[PDB]
Structures are given as structure tokens and as C-alpha cells.
Design a protein around this ligand. Structure first.
Ligand SMILES: O=c1ccn([C@@H]2O[C@H](COP(=O)(O)OP(=O)(O)O[C@H]3O[C@H](CO)[C@@H](O)[C@H](O)[C@H]3F)[C@@H](O)[C@H]2O)c(=O)[nH]1
Ligand SMILES: COc1cc2ccc(=O)oc2cc1O
Length: 475
């Protein structure tokens, strides 16, 4: 049983860097493996760096070591209109020569390479050194089913996916409304559509796929991935639901937001955040402002400067301070009026400490998967406000299938959410009986997910499975 060494590669972002850090911690801790993390990082991030601090010094004895990898300049392959998907692909691709050397320099060669959903293009580095290779899909199995099967849809739709009148039926799974298609499928003539479709096929060339979900949450989709005849003509490797994997709450006391929360009533605060990436569009930010206020509900609202372009176009940076005081893009005297009723928090906040707090009763989220899982594992119900990526599909699951979120009658992206509607949703969630029923569903998923990670039970075992697969391949 000589000790394993697993390297994990992370694409730039935060939704991407975090679940890797978590995953590495999970393995190093519970399954006595040596982890090394190759975190690719466009050093324009601020958050990423400060993050990477409060972890490496918490993971010294832990036998985790984080090697950061700076992405090369890709400004010669992009413009104002190149998407975040494509950017991300190109960064990792251009970084591939660097990883290559980084492994080669390692003394203890890794026995297994686990790569992010965006580092699928590192396959060759593992193929070269003849190491086991797995990809880590940090989101829903439903989206992984879409990716995989998308190579088929590509060859039997013709027109645009958004123009379709019938839903796209992934074999064996929940049918996808044309409106809830992930960003890359919104336009077929775009570079990211072909990148997406390549991603789908790249998944099949790994030795297995880790997913940040659990059997109890999305049963059918996983069963479809394992046994569905049409799908399995395409997939042909193990899946490993190892979730839900989230960060620990760190006992940080000097935080002001917390000190504000300590003065509040239980389950009395709506928490608002559009994740690490997302921004609102000035009008939507205004309507949201009035929503919170008309609601007469206590709130914490992480706000960032609005933009009437793409919500996600910030995604890559996150290290720009600028000269626009938050009181610019908020309504006149908003922080005067709402003081003692809410908290506007610029740029960033301690999301896991917040969501774990007694006074937080609700969460208006963008439906990123790590945010969602942070919500569900604290049994916090949610307002579903998808902006980009696969969040439309996640919101679809959370509202329709799992029943732990509410949402506006039209997608925010498709039409403005007026302040009345917002106020309405906030009151529903926080203060109506429907509110409390949704909260209970959330608390049941909380317990579900507790059993998933407890010894025995789905996700724990799927790790022991993965490790056994590694150790058999060591052949
Ligand atoms: O103020 C803040 C805001 C966020 N965070 C943390 O950063 C992560 C962002 O949440 P989420 O996974 O939804 O991230 P995001 O990168 O926006 O989503 C993309 O990346 C995700 C990949 O996991 C994907 O699911 C999604 O569809 C993509 F759009 C998550 O771990 C939060 O706890 C924080 O600490 N403080
Ligand atoms: C635009 O950005 C993203 C798009 C998708 C689409 C499908 C998926 O399974 O994951 C994604 C992760 C992303 O960061």
C-alpha cells in the first residue's frame, strides 16, 4: 500500500480553483494520499492570491503542496468579443508546455493526474508519462450528460438550439428546454461552440470522471451515464460522484459582516451574491436595489460595478479596485435609507461563513454550483438568478426537480426583473409558509448530502473506488 501521489490541475477562476483545493484537501485528509496542485492563474485576480494564502499555511503538515502556474499572454488570440469559455481554453492550452516541465521536474512522479473541466487539454502530459488520467467536472451530472451527448446533437439539429420549439432530450435524462442551454450552445457560429463540442469528446479519453454531486441528488442522470445504451456508446468509462465537496468554514471573527449578522434575528437575512464572476446591468441593479427595500427584509448584498455587456466578462480578473464608489450605481441615498436594515459589501465576502450563520435565512444566488452546494449543505433556500455558464440548467434543477429554490417567471437574462417581482420573491422566501416548506426541502438535501460523505454512502465510497482504480492502473 505504498503511498499515492496525485497531481490536480486547476484552470483560472475561483469556481475552478476552489473545488480543486477542496478536492485535494478531501483526499489528503481522509484517504492518506500526497496531493500536489498545479493551479493555473492569470495573476490578475487578487482574490485567488489571498485565497491561496489562507490554505497553504493551513495545509503544511497536511501533505498538500500548491504550485501556482502563470498563464502565458493570449492577447494575440482574443479580442473584446472572445468569450470567457474560449479565453479559458486558450489560457490552459498555452500553459501546456509549462505543466509539462513542472511534472518532469517532480521527483515523486504522480501516479494519477486529475484535471479540471478546462484542463482536458493536458491529456497528452499524462499519456506521455503513462499516468492515470481523470477529469473533474465540478458541476451537475446533467451538464456532463449534455457535454458528452452534444456531439450527437451537433449532427442532427441543423439550426440553432435556441430556435428549437421542442426540448433537447439527452438520452435517459431530464429534457432540456431550448432556453436553459448553457452559454456555449447559445450561438453555433461562435468559437466556443466548437470548443464545447471538443470538450464533450475529450471527456471520453480519460480513465474516469469525478463529479461534484451525489447519487441521491440526481439519481437518473448518473444511472443514464452508467447504463444508458445510447450514452454508453459515447462515454465508456467510470463516473465518480464524490460530492458535495465544499470548503470548511474558517473561524474568522474580525469580520464586520459577521459582527453585523450577530446582531440579527435567526433566519432573518437574505444573502445576495452573483458569485465570483457575475455582474448585473445597471437597470437590473437598480430594480434589485428597490426590490431590497420594498421587501422590508434584512439583507447582505455583495455588489460589484454594473455592466451592460456580458455578466461574466469580469470573471477572469477580480483584482480591479477602480474609482467608482458603490454609492454611484446604487440609487440616490440607498445606504442612508437601508442602513440598519441591510449591508452593501463591495466586491467580495466570506460566503461560507455567512451561509453557515444563524441569521441567514435565504440566498439570492446566480446558481453557480459551488455557491449552490454551500447553500444546500447549510440548508439555506434560494432565489435562482442564473446569469452565465450552466447556471440556467442548475436553476432548472433546483426549482423544477429538487424544489429548493424559487425564481422569476422569466429568466433575468431574457427580460428585466422588476422591483415588485423581486420584493415579492424575497418576501415569499423569507416570510411565507411556502418559504418555510422550501427551507425544509433544503434541510433534507443537507442531511442527504451529510450521509453521502459520511463513511459508507455514495460519495465516500466513490473515492475509495477511484483510489482502487488508481492502484490497479499502477500496473
Ligand atoms: O463573494 C464571494 C463569491 C464567491 N465566493 C466563492 O467562490 C466560488 C464561486 O461560486 P460558484 O462556484 O458559483 O462560482 P463562479 O465561478 O461564479 O461560477 C462559475 O464556476 C462554477 C464552477 O464550480 C460553475 O459551476 C458556474 O456555473 C460558473 F459560472 C464559491 O466557492 C464561493 O463560495 C466567495 O467566497 N465569495
Ligand atoms: C461559459 O462558461 C462555462 C460553460 C459551461 C457549459 C457546460 C458545462 O458542463 O460547464 C461549463 C462551465 C463554464 O465555466
Amino acid at each position: 500500500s505504498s503511498q499515492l501521489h496525485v497531481a490536480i490541475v486547476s484552470s483560472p477562476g475561483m469556481g475552478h480553483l476552489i473545488p480543486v483545493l477542496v478536492l485535494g484537501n478531501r483526499l489528503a485528509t481522509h484517504h492518506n494520499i500526497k496531493i500536489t496542485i498545479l493551479a493555473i492563474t492569470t495573476t490578475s485576480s487578487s482574490a485567488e492570491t489571498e485565497f491561496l494564502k489562507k490554505t497553504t499555511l493551513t495545509n503544511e503538515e497536511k501533505t498538500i503542496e500548491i504550485i501556482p502556474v502563470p498563464s502565458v499572454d493570449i492577447s494575440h488570440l482574443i479580442n473584446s468579443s472572445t468569450k470567457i469559455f474560449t479565453q479559458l481554453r486558450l489560457l490552459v492550452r498555452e500553459a501546456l508546455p509549462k505543466i509539462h516541465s513542472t511534472i518532469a521536474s517532480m521527483t515523486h512522479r504522480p501516479d494519477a493526474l486529475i484535471v479540471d473541466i478546462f484542463c482536458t487539454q493536458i491529456l497528452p502530459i499524462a499519456e506521455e508519462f503513462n499516468i492515470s488520467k481523470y477529469t473533474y467536472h465540478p458541476t451537475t451530472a446533467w451538464t456532463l450528460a449534455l457535454a458528452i451527448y452534444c456531439q450527437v446533437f451537433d449532427k442532427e439539429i441543423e439550426g440553432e438550439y435556441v430556435e428549437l420549439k421542442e426540448p433537447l432530450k439527452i438520452p435517459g435524462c431530464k429534457a432540456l428546454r431550448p432556453d436553459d442551454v448553457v452559454d456555449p450552445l447559445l450561438d453555433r457560429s461562435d468559437q466556443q461552440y466548437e470548443e464545447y463540442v471538443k470538450l464533450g469528446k475529450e471527456y471520453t479519453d480519460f480513465d474516469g470522471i469525478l463529479i461534484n454531486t451525489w447519487e441521491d441528488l440526481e439519481p437518473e442522470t448518473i444511472n443514464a451515464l452508467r447504463y444508458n445504451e445510447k450514452l454508453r456508446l459515447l462515454l465508456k468509462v467510470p463516473v465518480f460522484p464524490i460530492g458535495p465537496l465544499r470548503r470548511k468554514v474558517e473561524t474568522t471573527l474580525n469580520d464586520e459582516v459577521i459582527q453585523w449578522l450577530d446582531k440579527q434575528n435567526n433566519e432573518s437575512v437574505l444573502f445576495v451574491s452573483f458569485g465570483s464572476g457575475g455582474t448585473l446591468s445597471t437597470k437590473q441593479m437598480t430594480e434589485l436595489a428597490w426590490g431590497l427595500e420594498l421587501s422590508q427584509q434584512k439583507f447582505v448584498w455583495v455588489v460589484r460595478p454594473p455592466s451592460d455587456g456580458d455578466a461574466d466578462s469580469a470573471y477572469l480578473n477580480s483584482a480591479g479596485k477602480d474609482t467608482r464608489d458603490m454609492s454611484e450605481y446604487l440609487p440616490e441615498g440607498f445606504l442612508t435609507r437601508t442602513k440598519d436594515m441591510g449591508l452593501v459589501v463591495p466586491m467580495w465576502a466570506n460566503q461560507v461563513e455567512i451561509l453557515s450563520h444563524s441569521s441567514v435565512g435565504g440566498f439570492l444566488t446566480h446558481c453557480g454550483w459551488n455557491s449552490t452546494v454551500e447553500s444546500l449543505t447549510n440548508g439555506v433556500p434560494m432565489i435562482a438568478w442564473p446569469l452565465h455558464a450552466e447556471q440556467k440548467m442548475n436553476a432548472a434543477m433546483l426549482t423544477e426537480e429538487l424544489g429548493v429554490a424559487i425564481r422569476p417567471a422569466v429568466l433575468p437574462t431574457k427580460k428585466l426583473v422588476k422591483r415588485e417581482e423581486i420584493q415579492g420573491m424575497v418576501r415569499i422566501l423569507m416570510q411565507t409558509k411556502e418559504g418555510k416548506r422550501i427551507k425544509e426541502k433544503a434541510k433534507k438535501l443537507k442531511k442527504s448530502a451529510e450521509n453521502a460523505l459520511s463513511d459508507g454512502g455514495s460519495s465516500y465510497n466513490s473515492i475509495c473506488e477511484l483510489v482502487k482504480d488508481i492502484r490497479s492502473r499502477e500496473l
